Design a protein around this ligand. Structure first.
Ligand SMILES: Nc1ncnc2c1ncn2[C@@H]1O[C@H](COP(=O)(O)OP(=O)(O)NP(=O)(O)O)[C@@H](O)[C@H]1O
Ligand SMILES: Nc1ncnc2c1ncn2[C@@H]1O[C@H](COP(=O)(O)OP(=O)(O)NP(=O)(O)O)[C@@H](O)[C@H]1O
Ligand SMILES: [Zn+2]
Ligand SMILES: [Zn+2]
Lengths: 413, 413
């Protein structure tokens, strides 16, 4: 019945979830919700009710092909102002994909787009100092890189407010984003139609004086090729894409076809930022290493190298679900690294060395790696080592001399 | 009502503005005018009158598609001799772009093209000496580079008069420019139709004996490819494009597809000029550092390195809006750099080094960087440091030894 689906959607929206998974195995249907950063088994409904609510949810979507096509793959969107299922106000539009599984089974995936202090949410103080120098440059291009759940839009919206405040209304702030994101400056709104509308918006934005162009989700090769022209025309661009390690971004640019000469300019590129999101331990509900191993403590051999020398400073999630917080995790913090481009650093990458350029950036430019930033928060006890290893790789490969140098700078400040 | 729009346009034209912005937020509409180089909040009109005047202005344009299309993006032009809104005589034609914003909101942008002592408006004396040698060469190609509001057309018109006077009518001066610009020698006048007309004009100009061809706004790859042939045929070309730093121009040429061998000739290229426009402080209404910090003086830490050693010579804008001038700013001066091409300098760029070619130009050729020219005027107190930092980047990165050498040459002359 459609009312059961409406109630499930309403109770799922208010739970602050990321993604919704519904799996059908022809005997029971499992519900999964990505609470914080991981999915959890919510409930197991029966098959007939699951099929009924799936059909009701698909038929109430504004995009339909007048058939369900169980054997085929389906995709649809549900938008605001056209919904008969009493859509909650905390969501504007969602996308839902139906995938067949096994014999007469379904796999519904929903992305659940939501609506929504000055700076340094989880960034290091060096990152904040670098951002201050980055915001003062009148021209250039900056890249924000990370996975799908890396919180790029939140960082862009936070930087936009700082740019708006600091410039004292001496520049024009125009931003283009088809899905609205709470309150934000000027904001501008099939797959082919959406791509054509995005192309028209990005080719009409340059007609006006852009100053700061503020695009989003540079997905097409021609779009980013046009964007790079405006980057060197004398504008400033703040865009985000999907990448990792803060150095494979140039590989993505070369895959898109931006040529070698455009990326050799140190003046054009102004900074690279790579960020990940990891669960943050509760400060009130925390236990030490001895208290953790006293009650079913299991720690791998490779992890003991990370916590070596700082056993007391580390913290672990608190079990038994006390009155404070929910499960020992409050929010989700950011582990980020920022690279300031240089002539020699860009020349090394342009030669395709992929080795000793990272060493040059880490030593000469006094940069900090993502693994180093993760280890620094591990020492401080802000996050758990178990989630840090599962989210960030190569943490155990940091040398002791590097660890001492990282700890000395944090201790002296 | 159309009369309110006509009155607003008339009072905006006489105010000597650059661009016009109208933003609609469905409750009030904000008006912004780019006085000098920055926009300022003019007024907040109500929504219904704003929509009425926008509709009246769009319907009076000579280009229309018989619909407003609020949800879509629109662009139009208003030309002379066809206008029912009593167009002021100080403008020939304007272009106006309509952009949707939010829900039922508009974003009007207007470029406001205007109509309009021998030399050295704001250039250095070395720039004037280099221009004298540049004007005596019978063949070659020169490039003027800068952002949209860099005043390239004014510099080209100023150089054209010097070329006309100095040659004593021994050469033929032909210039091609579709929008007329006050009085100027011979002047020659959808987007596809305009491009085809420009192509026809540039392919018919070479039919006559060009001597000095004087083009404008080299925007197409085929147009500049044809222009480079006439450059090496034995003519002289004075064109302008959008670039920065006086060295990324070659990157723009390679993006347009001019090949490596055409740019390796030292005889072909005759000079590169990169200019920016910055607000100039009033000489009568000026205050020192102590007087500025005595009344709400806020200076960043990085700025104190620039003003180090020359605190008394620097000047700041004078508040309280005295009887003289308007707001302490009179006009807008030019910060420019000129690079004379050389065989080794062009060979270094042709190898794609992007490093030590700037050092070779700065040391061996005795050139002056844009940041160096900005710092020289900062020391003299002609312009404010706050605008110089916001318009020119990397000023604080100049070494002390370079500063001493720059100051010695200015002091000895
Ligand atoms: N301090 C924080 N930093 C980053 N993200 C946070 C923070 N706090 C909460 N979030 C999450 O940021 C999310 C906002 O959406 P966001 O992750 O920025 O979109 P996105 O990264 O572009 N994902 P996608 O569009 O699929 O690539 C919210 O769901 C929050 O759970
Ligand atoms: N000494 C000066 N030097 C340069 N420009 C000046 C000077 N004085 C005034 N101006 C401005 O020069 C402008 C003339 O238009 P101009 O800036 O040359 O067109 P443009 O640079 O080609 N812009 P665009 O066509 O959009 O690329 C006037 O608006 C003046 O405000
Ligand atoms: Zn707690
Ligand atoms: Zn004055």
């Amino acid at each position: 019945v459609e009312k059961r689906a409406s109630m499930l959607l309403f109770e799922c929206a208010e739970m602050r979830v990321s993604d919704l998974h519904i799996k059908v195995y022809d005997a029971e249907a499992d519900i999964y919700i990505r609470k914080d950063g991981d999915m959890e088994l919510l409930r197991q409904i029966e098959s007939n009710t699951a099929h009924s609510i799936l059909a009701s949810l698909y038929n109430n979507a504004d995009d339909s092909d007048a058939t369900y096509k169980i054997n085929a793959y389906q995709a649809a969107r549900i938008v605001a102002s056209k919904s008969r299922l009493a859509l909650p106000p905390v969501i504007q539009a969602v996308r839902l994909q139906f995938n067949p599984l096994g014999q007469g089974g379904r796999y519904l995936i929903a992305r659940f787009l939501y609506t929504d202090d000055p700076t340094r949410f989880g960034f290091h103080h060096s990152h904040a100092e670098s951002f201050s120098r980055m915001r003062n440059l009148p021209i250039g291009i900056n890249i924000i890189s990370g996975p799908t759940g890396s919180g790029k839009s939140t960082t862009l919206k936070n930087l936009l407010e700082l740019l708006y405040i600091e410039k004292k209304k001496k520049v024009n702030i125009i931003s283009i984003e088809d899905p609205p994101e709470y309150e934000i400056t000027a904001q501008l709104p099939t797959e082919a139609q959406r791509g054509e509308e995005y192309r028209k918006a990005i080719t009409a934005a340059l007609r006006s004086d852009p100053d700061i162009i503020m695009p989003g989700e540079a997905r097409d090769a021609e779009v980013i090729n046009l964007l790079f022209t405006a980057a060197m025309t004398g504008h400033q661009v703040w865009t985000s894409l999907h990448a990792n390690n803060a150095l494979a971004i140039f590989d993505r640019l070369k895959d898109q076809g931006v040529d070698e000469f455009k990326l050799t300019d140190p003046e054009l590129i102004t900074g690279l930022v790579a960020q990940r999101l990891v669960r943050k331990l509760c400060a009130q509900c925390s236990i030490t290493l001895t208290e953790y191993i006293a009650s079913g403590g299991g720690i791998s051999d490779t992890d003991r190298k990370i916590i070596s020398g700082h056993e007391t400073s580390v913290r672990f999630p608190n079990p038994r679900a006390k009155k404070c917080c929910r499960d020992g995790y409050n929010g989700r913090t950011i582990l980020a690294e920022v690279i300031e481009p240089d002539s020699k650093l860009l020349r090394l990458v342009a030669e395709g060395k992929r080795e000793d350029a990272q060493h040059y950036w880490l030593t000469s430019l006094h940069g900090m790696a993502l693994k180093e930033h993760a280890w620094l928060k591990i020492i401080s006890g802000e996050i758990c080592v178990m989630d840090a290893v599962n989210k960030i790789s190569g943490i155990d490969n940091i040398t002791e001399e590097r660890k001492k140098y990282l700890f000395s700078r944090d201790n002296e400040i």
